[PDB]
Design a protein around this ligand. Structure first.
Ligand SMILES: *[C@@H]1O[C@H](CO)[C@@H](O[C@@H]2O[C@H](CO)[C@@H](O)[C@H](O)[C@H]2NC(C)=O)[C@H](O)[C@H]1NC(C)=O
Ligand SMILES: *[C@H]1O[C@H](CO)[C@@H](O[C@H]2O[C@H](CO)[C@@H](O)[C@H](O)[C@H]2NC(C)=O)[C@H](O)[C@H]1NC(C)=O
Lengths: 329, 29
């Protein structure tokens, strides 16, 4: 009975007041659901709860079957559209993981497993960052910064997305135009444009306008423009229910759309924000991660997340990665 | 008619599949 995606969104915004935010819920939630796989006691429960698991309607396994389905429904780089999701386990040379954990990871999550010498911190980082970089076509370069020495295993998740718009924007239709960060801080940005039929929507409650711009394939970009002075209001009103409401509320309309060509990114240490969603234990020495290993002790040192997006007249490019680091002491 | 819609102030962004793939706020291009 909680909106993890939007609860996390607000947490990240509150922590960075008037700065850009960007992340991949699927990446983080899938990572969390994987983590719960080798979690026990209350720690295994804060995660499921934090995800908004029904414990009845949805039963743990349904959660995994879902992500499993998602991973399976993935298609090869079609034409002008590509979405890939992967999971990887990097295990120290001298540690054993429980058969169940490893098995579930390979079966439900199609996870790769790479032996890693964590005694050589520099080498471990290179191996892992190179993999994440490789999987995100060079969009996420340095996921880990100072890999602890007690690092004995790192669980990684990545997401890559590239797609051309269903209908591009006329490259020559872009002009330098004013952008108001605040009514007083204004900066020039290349403003894209295109008059056409779009799925419009006017939410008078949250107080904002929503446009749906489809991609060549299955993925639509939703751009929310909160009315003057209401960004905070709509941010608070964001919810899974709202998104559903917005989705069928959508009716096509003749629109002369002006969108700025942009690029943003976010880096977050999730171990710092998740306890705001009730996910705290697993990140402490009080953690119960007995499902992952028997030489217990281990906890989650940090959970780094990184996401980037590029938006131009051709389409969009987006990727992100989540690195769950398990240490010994 | 032809309604005008210009994103010249902070704005949210969703990249939706059947699930929410990406979410963020563009506070400043
Ligand atoms: C995303 O693409 C998939 C695979 O290309 C779609 O699956 C079916 O694709 C055929 C292609 O002609 C359509 O005729 C079917 O209607 C699709 N079935 C559905 C609705 O899943 C899929 O439709 C696309 N996105 C969706 C809505 O899942
Ligand atoms: C936002 O909330 C208002 C209420 O403050 C909604 O207004 C009505 O919406 C439906 C259609 O009339 C009804 O099912 C609601 O009960 C009614 N509101 C009430 C309780 O009076 C409005 O539709 C909502 N719109 C969106 C998009 O959220």
């Amino acid at each position: 009975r909680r909106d993890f995606t939007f609860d996390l969104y607000r947490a990240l915004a509150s922590a960075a007041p008037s700065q850009n935010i960007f992340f991949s819920p699927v990446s983080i939630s899938m990572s969390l659901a994987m983590l719960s796989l080798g979690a026990g006691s209350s720690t295994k429960m804060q995660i499921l709860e934090g995800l908004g698991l029904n414990l009845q309607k949805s039963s743990e396994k349904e959660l995994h079957r879902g992500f499993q389905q998602l991973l399976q429904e993935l298609n090869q780089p079609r034409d002008g559209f590509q979405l890939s999701l992967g999971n990887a386990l990097f295990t120290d040379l001298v540690v054993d993981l429980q058969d169940t954990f490893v098995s579930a990871m390979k079966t439900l999550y199609l996870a790769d497993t790479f032996p890693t010498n964590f005694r050589d911190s520099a080498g471990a980082m290179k191996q892992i960052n190179d993999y994440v970089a490789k999987q995100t076509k060079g969009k996420i370069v340095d996921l880990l910064k100072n890999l602890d020495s007690n690092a004995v295993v790192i669980m990684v998740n990545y997401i890559f997305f590239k797609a051309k718009w269903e209908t591009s924007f006329n490259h020559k239709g872009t002009q330098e135009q004013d952008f108001y960060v605040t009514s007083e801080t204004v900066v020039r940005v290349p403003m894209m444009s295109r008059e056409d039929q779009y799925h419009y929507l006017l939410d008078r409650n949250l107080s904002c306008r929503v446009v749906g711009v489809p991609y060549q394939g299955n993925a639509t970009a939703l751009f929310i423009l909160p009315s003057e002075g209401k960004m905070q209001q709509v941010e608070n009103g964001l919810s899974e229910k709202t998104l559903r409401k917005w989705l069928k509320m959508f009716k096509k309309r003749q629109l002369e759309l002006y969108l700025p060509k942009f690029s943003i990114e976010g880096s977050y240490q999730l171990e710092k924000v998740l306890p705001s969603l009730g996910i705290s234990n697993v990140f402490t020495s009080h953690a119960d991660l007995s499902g992952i290993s028997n030489h217990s002790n281990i906890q989650v040192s940090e959970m780094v997340h990184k996401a980037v997006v590029e938006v131009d007249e051709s389409g969009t490019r987006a990727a992100a990665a989540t690195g769950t680091i398990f240490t010994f002491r | 008619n032809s309604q005008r819609l210009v994103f010249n102030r902070p704005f949210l962004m969703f990249i939706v599949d059947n699930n929410i793939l990406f979410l963020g706020k563009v506070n400043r291009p």
